């Protein structure tokens, strides 16, 4: 039939991509990197512990001054901490008690949150009155909100479980671009060093490269067997790293069309659900579901440390902008800052 | 070191003290409330209703899609799950498979379930008229006998009452041959008539807490 003719064409197009991608693959990253001296064993220890949440924590974000911090728990409160000296600067009640994300503003004036509400809210931190109000509410997605990041003091990108991402306008309040193409719930996104490209992983074991200026997928990547939980761009603009729920992490190369390295072990069975990078880019920190985190070596793929000290599932993970400390959150409501 | 610097530290401490005071006030209202989930399947409204001193707080999920493998993990700390077994093809079996997934889930392996076989109009009148409900789908219904403890109140063809106790035992086979006594199931019949079912929820959450305390004291 007519429908069957189109399907046969897609198989031919798939093979030509495979042939070209296989042709360029000449060596492996392991062969070139097997001359560099291995890094020593790395040990850390907690410096600051923060208390005051009543339920499990779901999200956190560092400010662009390496001192302030925001958090969100499944209780209905957002708390702003001071890292150097344990203090509280704000504590904001929420209209919905089931949140799943929070963010920070490059300038330091607004904070956002989202959840099963399906709506994103923005709060004005600098009010001449003194209290904290609600600036605007953004409505239009049909599913639970997963991620959201500030691009401009007037623009913000969001992703939801209705298999769609969008770009919003804070002033008017309506979408300006809509992205389609995933066949599964979008779980995370990360912005480039500039503000012109970003990536997104979903429950279809896939990732895509998008463009804010014109909506379209520049490159589609494949590899992980199961659903993908976290993702983080490398500090160069030419690669990224991903973590899926089959006890694996992979490092894809955006400069060309293919994957480079894998980080796997036989003993580990649980999921990742957390990934990040250090400032130089030679140290990969990935959370895990067995109440612990690990430290790897992205240029050697050999484990070099652990992080024990959480008695429940690790949910969030972040590294400071200048690179001085590592913040970790868990379902035990005990944020701990490591060094 | 300077006049302004000294006031800075004192200013922060004063603000922290005010914040921590109301956090202690909110800790008492969070401890005294029980949370429920209305998983009616087989618009995201949250309603706070209160019976006497007891305040309850349930959540209904009507805006999501039919893929629950990701947003169902957010209800790890709820007291109980109210599953409404209410509305051709197989409809009892589709609800039957959904129960087993929840019952065996890794993060929901310590949560009790309250069953409401609603739509009492679903009857055995269809056995002799139109298409029968339990006709070919369950071939073992032929050689089944009612329990000796069946109590038909207004009564009717024993046939209807006999068919009722066949469905109840099907959910109990899944919920018994499983993990140890950290959770149970509370079947009930609701004739889809009035809101005297709040009473059943009040009387079922009381056994859930009571049996939890008797386990840590070895009783």
């Amino acid at each position, epitope marked *: 039939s007519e429908l069957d003719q189109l399907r046969q064409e897609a198989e031919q197009l798939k093979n030509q991509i495979r042939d070209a991608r296989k042709a360029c693959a000449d060596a492996t990253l392991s062969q070139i990197t097997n001359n560099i001296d291995p890094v020593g064993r790395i040990q850390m220890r907690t410096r600051r512990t923060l208390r005051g949440h009543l339920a499990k924590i779901y999200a956190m974000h560092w400010g662009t001054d390496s001192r302030l911090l925001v958090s969100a728990s499944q209780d209905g409160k957002l708390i702003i901490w001071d890292s150097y000296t344990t203090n509280k600067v704000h504590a904001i009640p929420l209209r919905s008690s089931w949140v799943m994300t929070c963010a920070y503003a490059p300038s330091g004036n607004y904070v956002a949150c989202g959840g099963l509400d399906n709506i994103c809210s923005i709060y004005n931190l600098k009010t001449r009155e003194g209290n904290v109000r609600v600036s605007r509410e953004l409505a239009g997605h049909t599913g639970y909100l997963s991620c959201c990041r500030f691009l401009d003091d007037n623009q913000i990108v969001t992703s939801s479980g209705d298999t769609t991402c969008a770009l919003w306008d804070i002033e008017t309040g309506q979408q300006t671009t809509t992205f389609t193409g995933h*066949t*599964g719930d979008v779980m995370s996104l990360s912005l480039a060093p500039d503000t012109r490209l970003f990536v997104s992983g979903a*429950c*279809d*074991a896939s990732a895509k490269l998008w463009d804010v200026r014109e909506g379209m997928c520049r490159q589609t990547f*494949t*590899g992980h*067997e*199961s*659903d993908i939980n976290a993702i983080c761009f490398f500090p160069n603009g030419n690669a990224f790293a991903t973590g899926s*729920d*089959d006890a694996t992490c992979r490092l894809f190369d955006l400069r060309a069309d293919q994957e480079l390295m894998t980080y796997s072990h036989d003993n580990i*069975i649980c999921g990742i659900t957390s990934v990040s990078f250090s400032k130089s880019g030679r140290l990969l920190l990935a959370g895990y579901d067995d109440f612990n985190c690990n430290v790897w070596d992205a240029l050697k793929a050999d484990r070099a440390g652990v992080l024990a000290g959480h008695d429940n599932r690790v949910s969030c993970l972040g590294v400071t902008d200048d690179g001085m400390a590592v913040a970790t959150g868990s379902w035990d409501s005990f944020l701990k800052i490591w060094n | 070191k300077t006049e302004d610097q000294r006031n800075e530290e004192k200013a922060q401490r004063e603000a922290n003290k005010k914040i921590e005071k109301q956090l202690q006030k909110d800790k008492q209202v969070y401890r005294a409330t029980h949370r429920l989930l209305l998983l009616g399947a087989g618009g995201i409204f949250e309603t706070k209703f209160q019976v006497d001193k007891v305040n309850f707080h349930m959540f209904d999920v009507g805006g999501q*899609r*039919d*893929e*629950r*493998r990701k947003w*169902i993990q957010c209800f790890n700390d709820v007291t109980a799950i109210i599953f409404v077994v209410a509305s*051709q*093809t*197989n409809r009892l*079996q*589709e609800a039957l*498979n959904l129960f*087993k*997934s*929840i*019952w*065996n*889930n*890794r993060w929901l392996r310590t949560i009790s379930v309250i069953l409401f076989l609603n739509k009492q109009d679903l009857l055995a009148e269809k056995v002799l008229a139109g298409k029968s409900k339990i006709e*070919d*789908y*369950f*071939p*073992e219904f032929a050689r089944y006998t009612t329990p000796e403890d069946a109590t038909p109140e207004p009564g009717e063809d024993p046939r209807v009452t006999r068919a009722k106790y066949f469905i109840r035992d099907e959910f109990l086979r899944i919920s018994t041959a499983s993990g140890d006594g950290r959770h149970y199931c509370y079947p009930h019949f609701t004739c889809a008539v009035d809101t005297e079912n709040i009473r059943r929820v009040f009387n079922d959450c009381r056994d859930i807490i009571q049996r939890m305390h008797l386990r840590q004291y070895e009783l």
Partner: nanobody
Amino acid sequence: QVQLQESGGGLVQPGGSLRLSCAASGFTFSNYKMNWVRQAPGKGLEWVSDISQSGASISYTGSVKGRFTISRDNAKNTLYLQMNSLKPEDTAVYYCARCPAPFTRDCFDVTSTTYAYRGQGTQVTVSS
């Protein structure tokens, strides 16, 4: 890169037997639990049978019990289904599923309007 493909089927008299075969690649066949899901000529989607990682635990819907059997062979990565004595109501499109996570006992998505890990089905008709 994950892909599932089914083969086998045709037109049969109201009485007899058939067999179905599915080939898989990409992931590790040992660690996942499979399923057999069938549609209907215009009537939702419903579950037929499923197996475990090893050939030890089985289950059946009940409508077809004592007639269908399911077998797994972890050497060529093939899933089989053998039929017996089919009736006029046994005509639909058959698919093959796979649970979302490897080392689990509960599946929350094998049946859905859209499934990311289900193949494209095959048509079988029992005519006279």
